[PDB]
Symmetry: C2
Subunit: 235 residues, 2 copies
């Protein structure tokens, strides 16, 4: 009854009034490629680095099952499809989102969405959490706060699924393309600090052909940061 | 993202751009009670524009009451049609007509612990000769999702009350069914008479011209209006 016209993502959609985690369900259940798992609220949701995700009613919480037949080295870039898809959807609603490498989307430096990718067998699960009408933590934002009006949640879902399907179909053919979209929609030219062991600071210059963040330290040294188990802060 | 607030029916919803049959998927798959299977179209064809869904139910009521599940679907559809100002009436015991034109059909299949309630309703889809749709009745396209929300809400209320008071559904059927007219019952041969009412078991009571009264149990018979 939803009348989705996408080719792969959205062929099937499993909606839950409540769920522990859309990503966990997607990982442990046999689902055909393109299946979208979406819930009104998550009781045990999280994002990258297992950062607890408050997923109250009003937000868009979903996961997508993908099994891309692309070279092994390209498989990691799936996370960027999510970030770019969110940026494209936000633009349709007149909101300018920018990517905080590698998994977050900010609006005027305020967090509005997060992406996470996990694996189970040969299946890849792309998880996305977008603040729409839900209440958000101080410092964060939502489509509702940015527009000063409630936003039809289903309309956001339709828009995002449409954008993700388009990006995914092209990814299967031209997998290097997504990096260019990320590059043009990410926050660069500013100082950042990579947290954790061997912590360092420098200017986030760009991302390379592997999606690694290229940072120029004040000494002139150039470091390439792999995305995945990385924590970054804007200075 | 749908924000359904129902108690059981609609706790989960599995949507398909296309499927062979929502009833077959529901019967075959491991699904929890209340899960709704809905598709834009069924290939084995229920065309795009219609509301094609199946609901997984596990009612813990006496076996003598289970035959009444089909009525939950028929009444639910009638209530939704009335919400859209369409006069749907029940053709005993599983069809809904508008001025004698088919607009919806209900199909229940079960094996005890799992009963599948299937419903097909013509909304914006093209329909066969003699049938009608919500779009044809209202004169314009009807938001399919709005019909879905309305129906799911009605079915959930009807189902929850049925679990506690299985007899209540019968009065809603009587109040919304086509009666007082001649019908032909086809099965082991056939007979004709006036459809008088439904009894406490949901059986159709027919008065033959001879005065004989027959009680029809659905399962291996078909009803035809004359």
């Amino acid at each position: 009854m939803l009348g989705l016209k996408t080719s792969i993502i959205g062929r099937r959609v499993i909606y839950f009034q409540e769920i522990t985690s859309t990503n966990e369900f997607a990982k442990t259940s046999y689902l055909e490629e393109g299946t979208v798992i979406v819930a009104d609220k998550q009781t045990m949701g999280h994002g990258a680095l297992n950062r607890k995700w408050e997923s109250p009613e009003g937000g868009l919480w979903l996961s997508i099952v993908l099994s891309p037949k692309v070279p092994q080295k390209d498989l990691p870039k799936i996370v960027f499809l999510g970030a770019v898809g969110v940026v494209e959807t936000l633009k349709e609603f007149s909101i300018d989102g920018r990517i905080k490498w590698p998994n977050d989307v900010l609006v005027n430096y305020k967090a509005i969405a997060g992406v996470l990718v996990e694996g189970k067998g040969d299946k890849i699960v792309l998880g996305i959490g977008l603040n729409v009408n839900n209440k958000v933590p101080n410092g964060a934002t939502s489509m509702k706060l940015e527009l000063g009006s409630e936003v039809p949640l289903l309309s956001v879902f339709r828009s995002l699924i449409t954008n993700l399907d388009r990006l995914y179909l092209n990814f299967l053919k031209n997998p290097m393309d997504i990096l260019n979209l990320v590059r043009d929609n990410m926050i660069l030219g500013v100082r950042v600090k990579i947290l954790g062991d061997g912590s360092f600071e420098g200017i986030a210059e760009d991302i390379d052909d592997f999606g690694r963040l290229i940072i120029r330290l004040d000494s002139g040294e150039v470091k390439k940061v792999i995305y995945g188990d990385v924590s970054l802060r804007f200075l």
